[PDB]
């Protein structure tokens, strides 16, 4: 009952998926071989007659080298070989190759493997899709997959975890093109999308974890903690739970306005030894500090539309209610005039788990806030500007047109982004 199928697309999707499933195994006491010496964890893990716990997940990439590491790694026994799907050559950082040229060759196979997982569900909640905005596969193949999932599963909820590009850790010059093209194509097929700005995570690792030059492993371990907080409400039976349907109804007022800002606290270096444990009020207040956000933007000069607080660890409702009561009296946190009771709270008793050999310190209690703010439209503005700089000269466009795309798709996608930025302006206006 109430199953969730995770789909990891391209390098970023796959590598983040590795970090998430490794963490889930530690949280639930599942060994790398699938043996588990609550039952809520069955939403993410199926069980075989041999007692093996297998992830309800599919890993897909157009090149084999990333997924080949999963196939030969520590957790190779965890996944059925048919859950790990690879092609021969990648999308060469081109949205058009992930969507058409290369993607078309593997799409049917992927949908068949997803159908097999869906058949094992007695009450499928929906899908969780992990991908980058910048990759040719992460952008192109994900768009193609989302469109096909809407045909095969109608209106079934589809949630994304999208990696927003950063110059500090970029892989291609055309990432802004792939980001706008995938955003345009996926917009009507996604119900809720959690964006993760790689620059925000990079900054958090440098400032809060004292890592001079963060690696993808450092970034992914932090991301996995946030993804775990979002999914903990589905994998554990706590005091107050939030199902996928409760996330969407509480966070998304308008279909297009579906990009919540995630904030997590506390992020403490393992090497720090005198810090006494932070209270519910202290960690809750940290959720309104820009230094703890997953996307770089300024909510103080924006309006809130929704606020969801996901606590984990030693947390009691009395302390949460007191912390929320003081947030309500803060003039510096402005809600839109059309939203009378903007809060949804969830509490999971299981404390935050930390990976052995990791960078994060173990804490008694943590919280992840998912807020719907007009300030997130700053992330779109920055991406659209990069797109405009290149597109004004038609730089690199020939690579996409060479793969059968029409130049008109670029302006159609960009017009949709301009309309989206306009939508965020309009929702903030008083009635």
């Amino acid at each position: 009952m109430r199953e969730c199928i995770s789909i990891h697309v391209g390098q970023a999707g796959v590598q983040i998926g590795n970090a998430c499933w490794e963490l889930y195994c530690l949280e639930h006491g599942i060994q790398p071989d699938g043996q588990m010496p609550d039952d809520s964890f069955n939403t993410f893990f199926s069980e075989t007659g041999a007692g093996k716990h297998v992830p309800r997940a599919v890993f897909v990439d157009l090149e084999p080298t990333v997924i080949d590491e999963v196939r030969t790694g520590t957790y190779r026994q965890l996944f059925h070989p048919e859950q790990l799907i690879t092609g021969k050559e990648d999308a060469a950082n081109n949205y058009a190759r992930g969507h058409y040229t290369i993607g078309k060759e593997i799409i049917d196979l992927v949908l068949d493997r997803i159908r097999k997982l869906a058949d094992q569900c007695t009450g499928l909640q929906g899908f969780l899709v992990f991908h980058s905005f910048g990759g040719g596969t992460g952008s192109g193949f994900t768009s193609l997959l989302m469109e096909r999932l809407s045909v095969d599963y109608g209106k079934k909820s589809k949630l994304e975890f999208s990696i927003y590009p950063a110059p500090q850790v970029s892989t291609a010059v055309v990432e802004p093109y792939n980001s706008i093209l995938t955003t345009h194509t996926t917009l009507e097929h996604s119900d809720c999308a959690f964006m993760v700005d790689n620059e925000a995570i990079y900054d958090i690792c440098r400032r809060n974890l004292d890592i001079e030059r963060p690696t993808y492993t450092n970034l992914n371990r932090l991301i996995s903690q946030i993804v775990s907080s979002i999914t903990a409400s589905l994998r554990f039976d706590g005091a107050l739970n939030v199902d996928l349907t409760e996330f969407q109804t509480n966070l998304v007022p308008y279909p297009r306005i579906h990009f919540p800002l995630a904030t997590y606290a506390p992020v403490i270096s393992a090497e720090k030894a005198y810090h006494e444990q932070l209270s519910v009020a202290e960690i809750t207040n940290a959720c309104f500090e820009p230094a703890n956000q997953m996307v770089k933007c300024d909510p103080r000069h924006g309006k809130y539309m929704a606020c969801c607080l996901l606590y984990r660890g030693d947390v009691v409702p009395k302390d949460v209610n007191a912390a929320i009561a003081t947030i309500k009296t803060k003039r510096s946190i402005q809600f839109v005039d059309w939203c009378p009771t903007g809060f949804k709270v969830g509490i999971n008793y299981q404390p935050p788990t930390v990976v052995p050999g990791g960078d994060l310190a173990k804490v008694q209690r943590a919280v992840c806030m998912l807020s719907n703010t007009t300030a997130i439209a700053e992330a779109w503005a920055r991406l659209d500007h990069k797109f405009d700089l290149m597109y004004a000269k038609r730089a690199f466009v020939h690579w996409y047109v060479g793969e059968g795309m029409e130049e008109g798709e670029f302006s159609e996608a960009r017009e949709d982004m301009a309309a989206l930025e306009k939508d965020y302006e309009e929702v903030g206006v008083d009635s």
Partner: protein, 430 residues
């Protein structure tokens, strides 16, 4: 008129419902196993109203537990009196309603409603003389509100001859779970106005204010709020559970309290207001009990009674006290506050006295008033509804279930008519 069938729907309904059964089981001398270990013969005289007698001389609540998710009912089963309930009476789905009235009423809940009606029918057939149904639910969620009102509709169709009574918890931003609570509440009130005979309006805004202001609890929890609700529910059903001069039944209550069919929403009140666990060091006098029960601070619906007029009132005093003194004080209240009682309904205040006091109190008083001031509660929901509906905020979650914007306009319109109807009788003269 003997048996009542209790139904509890959704998280709130099952939480206050479990507390109700804990409270009255204690009063009737029923332990968590269902065995009678009391002393007074009066505890058993009318125990058939709420309990069925099972083999082994056991007493089993005539209660049906409903929810679209297994979570809350696992918590009920694990609770203090969780083992007293009939296991076949737990009817639950797996999907949940996601605080969506449309999911509870039209889609997920409509798939479970027939399973519930089968249990209702089985309980109803074992009644020598079924008087009606009593439903506990909130109006802000999706199951208690959406599925609860769907159940009421189905029950009215199958048992048009029986009384439908509800304990409806009204939402407040002071104690909120979802942003769409005003939508769910408006759509539910629209159903209640048409399909219930008596509704007890339990306002979370009032319960929070009582806990915060009077009881000085800086951070009130649902457990603190539910202590006030269980006290009210025990009081309001004392006349049904214990022998008395008033041969109390659900129909006679409606006949004497409801002058106009749509105006059946009651403002309950309780005195003394006590906090969870902390021991009342003094006994309240009859004049103090009377003053307090009519005090706005003691009302369970966030409405100032002095802002309207009482159409009808039913007061119940519990504990060993002077019936002469109760009569004198009640008369004094009416003579001194004559401008708050409609002149065109002669002798509109009925008083009952029960010798058995509740647990922890030597004497208490429960109040049931049909006041035109209740329009303030509906105006509050209506304002919250309009603030969102004017921007069509969150509407796609309801239209996604097949609902039309027409249905929202009609529910709002019907609630606005209910408000103007209360205002009409507030202005009416002899």
């Amino acid at each position: 008129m003997r048996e009542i069938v209790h139904i509890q729907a959704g998280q709130c309904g099952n939480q206050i419902g479990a507390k109700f059964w804990e409270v009255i089981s204690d009063e009737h001398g029923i332990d968590p196993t269902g065995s009678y270990h009391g002393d007074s013969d009066l505890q058993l005289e009318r125990i058939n109203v709420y309990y069925n007698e099972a083999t082994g001389n056991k007493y089993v609540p005539r209660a049906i537990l409903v929810d679209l998710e297994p979570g809350t009912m696992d918590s009920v089963r694990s609770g203090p009196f969780g083992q007293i309930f009939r296991p076949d009476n737990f009817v639950f789905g797996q999907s949940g309603a996601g605080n969506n009235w449309a999911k509870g009423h039209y889609t997920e809940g409509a798939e479970l409603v027939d399973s519930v009606l089968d249990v209702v029918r089985k309980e109803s057939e074992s009644c020598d003389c079924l008087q009606g149904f009593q439903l506990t639910h909130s109006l802000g969620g999706g199951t208690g509100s959406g599925m609860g009102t769907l159940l009421i509709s189905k029950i009215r169709e199958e048992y048009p001859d029986r009384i439908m009574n509800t304990f409806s918890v009204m939402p407040s931003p002071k104690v909120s779970d979802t942003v769409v609570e005003p939508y769910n509440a408006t759509l539910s009130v629209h159903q209640l106005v048409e399909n219930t005979d008596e509704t007890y309006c339990i306002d979370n805004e009032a319960l929070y204010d009582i806990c915060f202001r009077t009881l000085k609890l800086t951070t009130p929890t649902y457990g603190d709020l539910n202590h006030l609700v269980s006290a009210t529910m025990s009081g309001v059903t004392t006349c049904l559970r214990f022998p008395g001069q008033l041969n109390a039944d659900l129909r006679k209550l409606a006949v004497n309290m409801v002058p106009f069919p749509r105006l059946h929403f009651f403002m309950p009140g309780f005195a003394p207001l006590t906090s969870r666990g902390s021991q009342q060091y003094r006994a309240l006098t009859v004049p103090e009990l009377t003053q307090q029960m009519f005090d706005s601070k003691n009302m369970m619906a966030a409405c100032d009674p002095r802002h309207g007029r009482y159409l009808t009132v039913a007061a119940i005093f519990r504990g060993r006290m002077s019936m002469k003194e109760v009569d004198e004080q009640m008369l004094n209240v009416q003579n001194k506050n004559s401008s708050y009682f409609v002149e065109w309904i002669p002798n509109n205040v009925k008083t009952a006295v029960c010798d058995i006091p509740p647990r922890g109190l030597k004497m208490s008083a429960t109040f049931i008033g049909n006041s035109t001031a209740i329009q303030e509660l509906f105006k509050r929901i209506s304002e919250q509804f309009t603030a969102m509906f004017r921007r069509k905020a969150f509407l796609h979650w309801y239209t996604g279930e097949g609902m039309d914007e027409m249905e929202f306009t009609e529910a709002e319109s019907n609630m606005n008519d209910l408000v103007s109807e209360y205002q009409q009788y507030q202005d009416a003269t002899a």
